[PDB]
Amino acid sequence: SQIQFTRHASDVLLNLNRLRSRDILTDVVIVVSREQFRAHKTVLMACSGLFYSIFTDQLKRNLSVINLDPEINPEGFNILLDFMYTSRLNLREGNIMAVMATAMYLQMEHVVDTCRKFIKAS
Amino acid sequence: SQIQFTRHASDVLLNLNRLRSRDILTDVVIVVSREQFRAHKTVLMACSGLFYSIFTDQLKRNLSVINLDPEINPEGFNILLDFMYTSRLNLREGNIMAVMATAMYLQMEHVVDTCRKFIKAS
Ligand SMILES: O=C(Cn1ccc2c(=O)[nH]c(NCc3ccccc3F)nc21)Nc1ccncc1Cl
Ligand SMILES: O=C(Cn1ccc2c(=O)[nH]c(NCc3ccccc3F)nc21)Nc1ccncc1Cl
Ligand SMILES: [Cl-]
Ligand SMILES: [Cl-]
């Protein structure tokens, strides 16, 4: 019987993206080939099975830098990071395979399923 | 023209609450009278003008403990912290004044407005 605020979760996410844009309380750098991306571990964990698995382990929880597999496309990663923080996925003809393969690696199954739909629709 | 995931922001928040429940990557303790509450600064900042104002200041950004005003009701605070992480506000007859006053102090204006509505409805 609690009162539901229907825009609250979305508003929080938007504010978290604003903090990311200002580098406030970011606690990890993700290195992908020649590029680097700063983020909040908590958001990464909430959105990715790979990052969840990494940072839940006490051995790896305080890591400040994560080097991704060198074969991962930085653009694919950037699209998915933007999705994590915005709920909006920038899927396009020229990026679909890179985004799909990166989502598989990051263990983002709902996103992988959505890419299967984009392929199907052409 | 991006693809909108309508449950993503909500799912993230839920996962963040799960991390809080497990004390994973919490980075602050909020002390309110005799009680203490652990949280993620980023979520606090996203949800409260008081916490935003505190942690944006470089002088205060690395604080690991925040002592709230001793007059603040811990139950009022707990209700609002639960709201921050769930989007669901536990407003009741026996708690409305405490929650409203705590929301004013925490600078949560939409919540204060909602409390004005509960009072009106009785
Ligand atoms: O669920 C997530 C992360 N996540 C987001 C999407 C997504 C996915 O598609 N596959 C996986 N596989 C790994 C896995 C992790 C957890 C439970 C089952 C499971 F199979 N994980 C994903 N994080 C989370 C869960 C619970 N409590 C707190 C947090 Cl932060
Ligand atoms: O907006 C918030 C926090 N917040 C949530 C509810 C709420 C409120 O009712 N009143 C206030 N007053 C202070 C204030 C802060 C910022 C802008 C205007 C402003 F008046 N702040 C609130 N945080 C945020 C904003 C932007 N970028 C990143 C983050 Cl994390
Ligand atoms: Cl910082
Ligand atoms: Cl931790």
Curated annotation (Swiss-Prot), chains A, B:
Q: Where is the signal peptide?
A: none
Q: Where is the BTB domain?
A: 26-93
Q: How is it modified after translation?
A: Phosphorylated by ATM in response to genotoxic stress. Phosphorylation induces its degradation by ubiquitin/proteasome pathway. Polyubiquitinated. Polyubiquitinated by SCF(FBXO11), leading to its degradation by the proteasome. Ubiquitinated by the SCF(FBXL17) complex, leading to its degradation by the proteasome: ubiquitination by the SCF(FBXL17) complex takes place when aberrant BTB domain dimers are formed.
Localization annotation? Nucleus
Which residues span the membrane? none
Q: What induces it?
A: Down-regulated during maturation of dendritic cells by selective stimuli such as bacterial lipopolysaccharides (LPS), CD40LG and zymosan. Protein levels decreases upon genotoxic stress in a dose- and time-dependent way.
User: In which tissues or organs does this protein occur?
Assistant: Expressed in germinal center T- and B-cells and in primary immature dendritic cells.
Subunit: Homodimer. Interacts (via BTB domain) with the corepressors BCOR, NCOR1 and SMRT/NCOR2; the interactions are direct. Forms preferably ternary complexes with BCOR and SMRT/NCOR2 on target gene promoters but, on enhancer elements, interacts with SMRT/NCOR2 and HDAC3 to repress proximal gene expression. Interacts with histone deacetylases HDAC2, HDAC5 and HDAC9 (via the catalytic domain). Interacts with ZBTB7 and BCL6B. Interacts with SCF(FBXO11) complex; the interaction is independent of phosphorylation and promotes ubiquitination.
Q: What is known of its domains?
A: The BTB domain mediates homodimerization. Its dimer interface mediates peptide binding such as to corepressors BCOR and NCOR2. Interaction with corepressors through the BTB domain is needed to facilitate the rapid proliferation and survival of GC B-cells but is not involved in the T(FH) formation and BCL6-mediated suppression of T(H)2 and T(H)17 differentiationrequired for GC formation.
Q: Which disease is it linked to?
A: Chromosomal aberrations involving BCL6 are a cause of B-cell non-Hodgkin lymphomas (B-cell NHL), including diffuse large B-cell lymphoma and follicular lymphoma. Approximately 40% of diffuse large B-cell lymphomas and 5 to 10% of follicular lymphomas are associated with chromosomal translocations that deregulate expression of BCL6 by juxtaposing heterologous promoters to the BCL6 coding domain. Translocation t(3;14)(q27;q32). Translocation t(3;22)(q27;q11) with immunoglobulin gene regions. Translocation t(3;7)(q27;p12) with IKZF1 gene 5'non-coding region.
Describe its function. Answer: Transcriptional repressor mainly required for germinal center (GC) formation and antibody affinity maturation which has different mechanisms of action specific to the lineage and biological functions. Forms complexes with different corepressors and histone deacetylases to repress the transcriptional expression of different subsets of target genes. Represses its target genes by binding directly to the DNA sequence 5'-TTCCTAGAA-3' (BCL6-binding site) or indirectly by repressing the transcriptional activity of transcription factors.
Q: What is this protein called?
A: B-cell lymphoma 6 protein
Q: Which organism is it from?
A: Homo sapiens (Human)
Q: What is the lineage of its organism?
A: Eukaryota, Metazoa, Chordata, Craniata, Vertebrata
